[PDB]
């Protein structure tokens, strides 16, 4: 589809059995989850942003369906205030910038 | 122009006479500055950010030329790492994510 930004580009997400709203955002490298109670192994990853900092803990391989394409990446699971889908699943969808 | 988003969205801005870089970012409502000049009068505005909250100044009418195209809108400047144009100014010059 084709978002006009005068809305905040918010988007229903499936990921490991529950359903929950994700903000596609192309200034995020990575993709940040919140309440999202994810199955398996997790590594650590120190991530940051404006304000600063954050503890979040690295899931890979994870399954996501990003309205109803389906895409394999890496989730932080965080005490995030809004979900994320950043560039590295956006680009796995096809999403691109238009102007 | 059409940007793909494995690299970061990453183009040049014209600012208050100033030359610099700012990055397209989807999910920021407000467009914030790195610490620069920028002459007149503000409004105190602090809004949240992923780790925290940041103290900005709302400045008004502001003109930005971002990537040739001309936008006239609100700037805050402040201490950000990097620095974002935000649906504020991307809804002006007419940008929308596809897939
Ligand atoms: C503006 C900027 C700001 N947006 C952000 O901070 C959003 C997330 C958010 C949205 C809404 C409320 C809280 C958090 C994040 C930004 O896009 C930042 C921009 C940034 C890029 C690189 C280095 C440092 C910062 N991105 C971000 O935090 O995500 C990564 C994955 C890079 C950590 C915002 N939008 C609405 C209110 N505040």
């Given at each position: 589809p084709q978002i006009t930004?005068?809305?905040?580009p918010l988007v229903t997400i499936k990921i490991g059995?529950?359903?929950?709203?994700?903000?596609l955002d192309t200034g995020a490298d990575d993709s940040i989850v919140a309440?999202?109670?994810?199955p398996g192994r997790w590594k650590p990853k120190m991530v940051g942003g404006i304000?600063?900092?954050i503890k979040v803990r690295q899931y890979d391989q994870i399954l996501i369906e990003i309205c109803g394409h389906?895409?394999?990446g890496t989730v932080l699971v965080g005490p995030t205030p809004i979900n994320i889908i950043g560039r590295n699943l956006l680009t796995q969808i096809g999403c691109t910038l238009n102007f």
């Open positions: 930004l005068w809305q905040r059995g529950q359903l929950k709203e994700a903000l309440g999202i109670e994810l304000g600063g900092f389906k895409a394999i």
